[PDB]
Amino acid sequence: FSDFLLKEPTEPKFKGLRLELAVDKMVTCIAVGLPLLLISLAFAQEISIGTQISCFSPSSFSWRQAAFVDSYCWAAVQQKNSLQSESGNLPLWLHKFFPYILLLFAILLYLPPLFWRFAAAPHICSDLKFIMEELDKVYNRAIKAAKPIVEQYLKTKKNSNNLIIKYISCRLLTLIIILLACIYLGYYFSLSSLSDEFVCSIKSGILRNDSTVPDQFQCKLIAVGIFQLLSVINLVVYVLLAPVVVYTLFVPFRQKTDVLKVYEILPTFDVLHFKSEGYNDLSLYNLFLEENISEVKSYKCLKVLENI
Amino acid sequence: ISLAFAQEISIGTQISCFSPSSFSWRQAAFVDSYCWAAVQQKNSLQSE
Amino acid sequence: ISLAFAQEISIGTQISCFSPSSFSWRQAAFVDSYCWAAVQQKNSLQSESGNLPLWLHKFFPYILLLFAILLYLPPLFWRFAAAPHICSDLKFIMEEL
Amino acid sequence: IVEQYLKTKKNSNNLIIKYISCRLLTLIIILLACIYLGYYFSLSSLSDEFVCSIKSGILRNDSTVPDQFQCKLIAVGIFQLLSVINLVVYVLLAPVV
Numbered sequence: 001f002s003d004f005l006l007k008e009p010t011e012p013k014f015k016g017l018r019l020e021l022a023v024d025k026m027v028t029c030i031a032v033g034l035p036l037l038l039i040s041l042a043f044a045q046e047i048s049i050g051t052q053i054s055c056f057s058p059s060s061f062s063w064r065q066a067a068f069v070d071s072y073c074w075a076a077v078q079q080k081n082s083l084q085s086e087s088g089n090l091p092l093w094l095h096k097f098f099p100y101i102l103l104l105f106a107i108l109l110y111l112p113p114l115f116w117r118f119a120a121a122p123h124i125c126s127d128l129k130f131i132m133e134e135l136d137k138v139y140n141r142a143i144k145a146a147k148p149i150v151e152q153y154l155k156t157k158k159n160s161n162n163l164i165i166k167y168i169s170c171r172l173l174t175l176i177i178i179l180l181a182c183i184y185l186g187y188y189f190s191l192s193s194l195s196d197e198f199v200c201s202i203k204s205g206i207l208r209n210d211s212t213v214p215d216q217f218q219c220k221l222i223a224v225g226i227f228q229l230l231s232v233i234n235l236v237v238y239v240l241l242a243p244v245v246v247y248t249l250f251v252p253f254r255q256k257t258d259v260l261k262v263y264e265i266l267p268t269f270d271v272l273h274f275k276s277e278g279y280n281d282l283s284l285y286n287l288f289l290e291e292n293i294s295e296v297k298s299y300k301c302l303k304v305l306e307n308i
Numbered sequence: 309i310s311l312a313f314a315q316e317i318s319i320g321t322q323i324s325c326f327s328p329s330s331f332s333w334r335q336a337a338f339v340d341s342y343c344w345a346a347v348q349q350k351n352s353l354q355s356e
Numbered sequence: 357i358s359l360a361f362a363q364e365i366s367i368g369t370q371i372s373c374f375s376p377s378s379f380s381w382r383q384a385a386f387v388d389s390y391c392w393a394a395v396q397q398k399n400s401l402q403s404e405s406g407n408l409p410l411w412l413h414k415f416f417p418y419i420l421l422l423f424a425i426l427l428y429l430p431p432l433f434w435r436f437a438a439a440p441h442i443c444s445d446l447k448f449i450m451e452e453l
Numbered sequence: 454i455v456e457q458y459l460k461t462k463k464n465s466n467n468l469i470i471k472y473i474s475c476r477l478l479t480l481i482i483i484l485l486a487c488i489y490l491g492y493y494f495s496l497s498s499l500s501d502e503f504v505c506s507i508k509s510g511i512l513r514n515d516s517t518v519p520d521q522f523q524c525k526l527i528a529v530g531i532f533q534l535l536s537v538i539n540l541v542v543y544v545l546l547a548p549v550v
Binding site for chain 4: 359360363364368369370371372373374375376386387388390391394395399400401402403406409410412413414416419420423426427430431433434437438441442449452453
Binding site: 022025026041048049050051054055056057059061063066067194196220222224225229233294297300 | 361364365369370378379380381382383385386389390392393396397415418421422432436437440441443444445448
């Protein structure tokens with residue numbers, strides 16, 4: 001009990017706070033930023049050196065007939081009419097549309113943070129600002145006496161489940177999308193065959209019953225050997241990222257019930273009630289506050305007291 | 309639309325016709341341009 | 357990497373093979389594309405003692421960019437994990453002095 | 454009050470281990486990049502030339518394709534120079550770390 005500095009009231013408070021946790025923004029950062037990076041690198045090298053397909057046409061063909069054979073056999077991996085590799089026809093379908101599927105997973109790994117921004121941002125923002133102003137004002141009356149409203153609010157949030165289920169649902173959606181991307185990339189690398197080569201035929205329309213076109217063409221898909229490398233490194237990153245996402249589901253486990261242990265030195269609080277050990281909104285606030293304690297200077301001023 | 313335009317301007321044209329080998333390059337380009345511009349009018353397309 | 361990509365897209369391709377004179381233009385382009393795409397699989401390359409150098413020569417800029425990315429994550433972790441604590445403690449000790 | 458705060462920080466280890474772990478991660482990534490670039494320059498052979506073959510699918514049992522092709526990788530001689538200067542810079546940077 002001595003003299004300590006009082007806190008002036010200021011209106012521009014906290015310069016905007018952390019509406020997301022630390023490791024969750026990092027996880028969505030890496031999990032959306034990796035496949036877009038791989039897609040951009042693949043498109044740069046593909047538009048630099050090479051086409052997507054190349055077929056071996058006879059020497060008596062002109063240039064435009066060889067270009068027709070390339071365009072026809074590129075456009076005819078969809079329909080299963082005559083490709084002579086129907087056991088691996090679905091790999092031939094996947095080899096054309098791999099970057100579209102990778103970009104689709106990159107888009108679907110972005111919607112749960114957008115829903116968290118449009119649905120859970122201003123409620124947690126206003127509640128954090130209110131509890132911070134309440135702590136800042138309840139510290140100022142402590143030194144004037146030396147010259148419980150939060151204890152009921154933390155009971156109010158004890159019996160409510162309206163934000164923790166939203167947080168858990170967003171994390172579970174992110175986890176199952178991660179697992180589906182993992183099994184898809186594992187399958188696409190696990191084909192791994194000589195499935196880039198196939199046999200195409202152009203005798204379909206009035207070119208049937210001809211004697212100039214040679215009835216068989218050997219075609220090869222060029223960009224498969226880069227796609228398999230991209231799938232390997234993306235699979236390795238997502239497998240190393242999955243234990244973090246299963247670790248951030250145990251909300252009452254990775255919390256410490258001493259974020260307001262320092263405030264019982266002030267004789268008015270007697271704040272000891274944090275025996276939650278459960279899945280209430282109090283256990284979510286107990287972790288959303290512990291990262292955000294760097295904007296109450298009363299906490300820093302009280303940190304010097306109990307250790308001497 | 310942006311993804312389709314990127315892949316279309318990357319790899320491929322819109323149409324390709326199979327002209328005989330005795331044609332030159334510009335005659336094959338004429339056949340491509342003509343049969344691309346003639347899907348509007350229904351004169352002789354055999355798939356009416 | 358940027359200088360190498362500028363000079364590579366300026367003057368040259370990545371591979372060039374010597375096809376016979378009776379081939380047309382598109383058959384020579386097929387031979388180039390095929391032998392560029394077939395340095396991965398070890399079927400018939402006749403230099404299997406140095407096959408891993410042939411694999412590395414294609415993917416050198418990817419590996420160099422991967423090391424450039426992995427040399428960036430520890431400052432990002434220091435920014436997301438050790439910045440505001442040291443910031444507030446420095447401001448407090450400065451105001452105290 | 455500062456004479457007790459500097460005793461408070463005297464018995465805590467929560468930021469120095471984070472700083473040391475970030476520097477050690479940076480050092481081992483630097484050393485792995487150094488040994489990789491050293492190996493890639495140390496191959497240095499005539500490994501840019503190789504012999505390719507296209508007789509794989511229905512082109513097997515043919516009489517027009519000439520069964521052997523001499524191919525050469527073009528951009529190797531620039532990559533070796535880039536690896537040399539990157540290795541020299543990282544070796545001079547390791548004593549600072």
